[PDB]
Symmetry: C4
Subunit: 259 residues, 4 copies
């Protein structure tokens, strides 16, 4: 019963005070690691003996490294204990949660085994972009009433269909806008993939304004794209609202049929 006790402590933290406090402690380290990751890019001032101000992640290299290694030791101990007290270890590993945990904790170890190649370029940048995966664990720790998740998986069909229609519309409008605008002077529409950016920014009603049409045909088709973008942003709202209300009432019905 010891292994089942540790497991029921893990996926049901509220049962035991010690389980609850371990839950809150690992949540706190996830939060501090996320905040440290965000902070270690902020350029600290006073530029001590440097041509340009160094970010807090290079000026205080050892401090942020010690904080990172404390967080990663906590995460690794968590994952090892979960792998121990898992009833079906293979099924536990196959869960997307363990995948996220391992791909979040790996960057630290992979950087530690490449300290000799400290002058590496490009690869470590992606490696430590994957250090943003700890926010996923943090979102998991707030596993409140996920009516929104149920609504999203209820609407998944129409959302994927809208994504496919949006892809077709993006390709069509990008072709049209590129051919209308390839001939302008210093034109930003240098290719159809280049016009993909303008199209996706227009159909979402961003309009950054870096790429704008400069020709009458380009402006006509940009207007058509704008209207289709109005439709794009507007359509999901009523159906998401309806599905949310439906699942909400369904959950109260389930609660009452449990009483």
């Amino acid at each position: 019963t010891a292994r089942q006790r540790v497991w029921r402590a893990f996926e049901n933290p509220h049962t035991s005070t010690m389980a609850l406090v371990f839950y809150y402690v690992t949540g706190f380290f996830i939060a501090v690691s996320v905040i440290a990751n965000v902070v270690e890019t902020v350029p600290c001032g006073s530029s001590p003996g440097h041509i340009k101000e160094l970010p807090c992640g290079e000026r205080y290299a050892v401090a942020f490294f010690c904080l990172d290694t404390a967080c990663v030791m906590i995460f690794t101990v968590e994952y090892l204990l979960r792998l121990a007290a898992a009833p079906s270890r293979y099924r536990f590993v196959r869960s997307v949660m363990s995948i996220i945990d391992v791909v979040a904790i790996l960057p630290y170890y992979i950087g530690l085994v490449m300290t000799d190649n400290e002058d590496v370029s490009g690869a470590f940048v992606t490696l430590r972009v994957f250090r943003v995966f700890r926010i996923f664990k943090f979102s998991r720790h707030s596993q409140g009433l996920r009516i929104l998740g149920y609504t999203l998986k209820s609407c998944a069909s129409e959302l994927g269909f809208l994504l496919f229609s949006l892809t077709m519309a993006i390709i069509i409008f990008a072709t049209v806008m590129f051919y209308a605008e390839k001939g302008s002077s210093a034109s930003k529409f240098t290719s159809i993939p280049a016009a993909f950016w303008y199209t996706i920014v227009t159909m979402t009603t961003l309009g950054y304004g870096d790429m704008v049409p400069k020709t009458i045909a380009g402006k006509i088709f940009g207007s058509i794209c704008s209207l289709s973008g109005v439709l794009v942003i507007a359509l999901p709202v009523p159906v998401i609202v309806s599905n949310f209300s439906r699942i909400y009432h369904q959950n109260q019905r389930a609660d009452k049929r449990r009483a």
Copy 2:
């Protein structure tokens, strides 16, 4: 009886006629204070002897000071009339509108007790900002503002967690976008907090365009971010309208139970 008579004159001023008069007088004074606050920052111009065109609040500082102190005298006397006529002084003081009144009137007296050093900087700006909360006193003049407050109080936990998830998505997108765009030339994505601005502007479908991606990876993730903004537009609507409908329907049921 005078205490409770004045109280009833206050919270149901439609019963009496002098109470309605005082109601409309204090509403007028609130409007006057708000309009004076807005206008006194407008550059009046045409001021000889000063190269910089002073605002109407410094060229005619005497008139605006007299107007604001008259408005705050009205607010102070009406607040003391509320307090003196309350059946329960503690309950009224703890009530949110009392906090609104006190946060509206305290800045003037704080400026009075600070005026010994007219060279105050950094604090007077905060006082001026808090001088706008006199507009919140219009809730007493609008059942719509009361029902909006009740709706927001109902949408407390769920909008809180929705904002938490939005913040988590902002952190994720800011991380990926900073690391995609830190290396560009004269880049504005100088840190992850710096890219917080781009992420929040994109996820809301503003697209100021002041800072836009310039790399292929940055543009791919900006496209994903805007597409997620399409869902950001629709996410709060279900729960906001559901809570509003709940409040409205219990109001209807209560009004029918009255009949």
Copy 3:
């Protein structure tokens, strides 16, 4: 019965072939006058003997004036016949339709009585801005199933309330942004009315990008304003949808209870 015949020809065009053709003819002149008004501002090319290319409204002054006077004679004859065949002439005049008709036809006559002051400035510009009022007549001629109008007048209460809340939010956010951003260099937030523009452009999720925050406090409050703008644009959709469906079903119910 002659006057009632002319009236029933006017407000019920489909009855008589001659009534229908007069309806279509006056619709066609409204369309041609609108198109002429739009065109007479387009700068025609070839710049014949001019420092700068003249618009089609000054190069062909007589042609556009003759087209305008033909349209205005048709409109005046229409309005005179309506005033004749009106059963209650005073009530007919008091209708907003006759107000729009007279304020649309007046610009021509008022310009004709001020041809001596052909060098007038400013006033005639507004006078001929009111020449855009003919589009209102044109929209009237398409008096199809106005379920949208009924829905809008059904939602008028909540729409006005949302407008009032938007006004309060604009004033509050403008005060906050101006005080956060008055101190920047070459700042566009030179007053609270100046920040009205930024606020209204942000809460509607336009983000032109001419006025953007440049300070950390300004960016924080611009983010709050952006989120409130998401709420602003998102909220009307479900309620308009519900009201539209309700009135739609009500209209089919009315049609069937008429059968």
Copy 4:
């Protein structure tokens, strides 16, 4: 029987297996043609002897011409197989998908009959634009595209009149905004059609910001225009979702009547 056997193989290719094979082959060829069209505009670069980096469509024009003519040979033979196996040649030819097929394949043969003069300019761009309508042939591969087409055909008159009203509002706002902003310095509101661009960009809540108001009156009317864009976002949703629900519910009723 061969005619009808092949026909059934075409419009219900799930029945057979060789029909499913030909189905997936032609879907693959449609995807290949679309991707080739997009890619061949991308500047390949690294081309010695040419200062301008040619697109992949001119550096490797032979490969892309062979690929496109192979795709169009497949399209031509499959179209002639549809036509030859149709029970009713006229009904099939008049059917919209036949128009899609012919408008997809005609540009290639028009280019073939134009190739005697390879210096064609202005027409070849139109042919290239119409070469994207091969993407529409994916409707045969998506029940979602068919139901979207049915919905749009249902939302024919009402969206038409909604677009008419939107155009009328665009004309009104463009008139007032041009006359508010014609007098500014280096103004981009050079005509009412010039302000059509600003009006459509603002009413859709894009706000590129390329052309923004610079006058107080221009800013007031731009605020009104954006506020109207808030309604523009919500206007088509009721009728679009109502018609979609009608189509979906009659589909459900038919499928139940099957059982």
